[PDB]
């Protein structure tokens, strides 16, 4: 384990310098045909640096002239023999006191290296190379490449330098309508693929994947992967992060909440929404949607779910998981005391239906889902 703070030093922040070499006396690998970074490479490299300082306690300060720097950037074009090299991609050196430590080198004969802003592999290479120059041993979708640190990278880099708890501490939106000002978290139209692992240090946050028509599986659980915009496992939530809300697209989606209070919106299409623990607010959207409950703890009276757009005769509430302790019986207007009974109660004054479930072994009625609108017995799956 190595970092800029030494060997086997963990959770210690670092202030680092970086530099775009304008010339060299030699490249530590023995490669030759040095070429300085172009303007696009410079911009993309800074975006890559930013994606690291976003998640860990690192600061990056550019230096110029003859000042030495922790991390350097430069291109090569030829091997030690002086022959053109159009095969290799890039490499970098660990932190340390040795010559060329922290330096990173990229093959200028590769179009993706010259145009990292328009050729995604280039940006990803910058991110990986910087990762290694920071001390990561092994940094790192329909032909697309994620440009920012992924879930294991984030864990590892935070292990070395500590987690950055000042990042996006307000209410953050990831995906469409993003307010992150990060290209890798932002989708501008339905053709934009998303590949990211979200680091977020506070506030009430939303996964807005409303612009896609693919069937999506969206999971708000810390450390879990989602299938977004027709890709698979392209989105994840870093360890230590709580995302609260999620918006599906026009496809038939699955939205899985976490233990926090979640606002879930299915959008058009036939969606499956699962609030999990906590007081969730669920919008099925247009289409035939199913609201799933997996245990009594999902919607206690002290912290009940709201289903805000239920469509009688169209949507479903799924209580089949309660079978495991005796199948539920529907009662019209009164419980017997026997338990495992479900009642729908219409509040005419407010136009609210209260779904009450008296669970086996409970002295009181402890399960409640409040519904804005009417619901029928045949809307409930037991």
């Amino acid at each position: 384990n190595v970092s800029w703070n030494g060997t086997n030093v963990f959770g210690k922040s670092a202030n680092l310098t970086f530099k775009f070499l304008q010339s060299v006396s030699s490249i530590p690998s023995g490669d030759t045909g040095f070429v300085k970074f172009n303007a696009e490479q410079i911009e993309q490299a800074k975006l890559s640096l930013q994606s690291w300082s976003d998640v860990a306690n690192l600061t990056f300060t550019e230096v110029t002239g003859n000042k030495s720097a922790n991390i350097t950037f430069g291109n090569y074009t030829r091997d030690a023999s002086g022959n053109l090299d159009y095969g290799t991609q890039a490499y970098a050196y660990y932190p340390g006191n040795y010559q060329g430590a922290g330096s990173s080198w990229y093959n200028y004969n590769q179009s993706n290296i010259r145009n990292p802003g328009s050729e995604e592999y280039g940006r990803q290479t910058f991110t990986h190379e910087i990762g290694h120059a920071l001390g990561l041993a092994h940094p790192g979708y329909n032909g697309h490449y994620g440009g920012a640190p992924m879930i294991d990278d984030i864990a590892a880099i935070q292990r070395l330098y500590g987690a950055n708890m000042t990042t996006r501490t307000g209410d953050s939106v990831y995906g469409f309508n993003s307010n992150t000002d990060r290209d890798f978290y932002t989708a501008t139209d339905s053709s934009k693929a998303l590949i990211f692992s979200v680091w977020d240090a506070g506030g009430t946050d939303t996964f807005d994947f409303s612009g896609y028509s693919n069937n999506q599986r969206i999971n708000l659980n810390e450390g879990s992967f989602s299938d977004v915009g027709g890709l698979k496992g392209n989105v994840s939530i870093a360890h230590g992060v709580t995302i609260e809300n999620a918006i599906g697209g026009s496809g038939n989606d699955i939205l899985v909440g976490n233990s926090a209070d979640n606002i879930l919106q299915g959008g058009a299409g036939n969606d499956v929404l699962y609030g999990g623990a906590g007081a969730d607010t669920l919008y099925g959207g247009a289409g035939r949607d199913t609201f799933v409950y997996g245990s009594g703890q999902d919607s206690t009276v002290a912290a009940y779910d709201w289903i805000a757009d239920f469509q009688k005769g169209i949507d479903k509430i799924d209580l089949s998981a309660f079978r495991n302790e005796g199948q539920l019986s529907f009662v019209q207007d009164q419980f017997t005391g026997k338990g495992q009974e479900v009642m729908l109660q219409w509040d005419a004054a407010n136009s609210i239906t209260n779904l009450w479930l008296h669970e086996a072994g409970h002295s009181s009625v402890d399960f409640l889902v409040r519904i804005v609108g009417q619901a029928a017995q045949s809307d409930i799956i037991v």
Binding site: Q89, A90, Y91
Partner: peptide
């Protein structure tokens, strides 16, 4: 120590 990119 060096790491290369594929």
């Amino acid at each position: 120590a060096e790491a290369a990119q594929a």
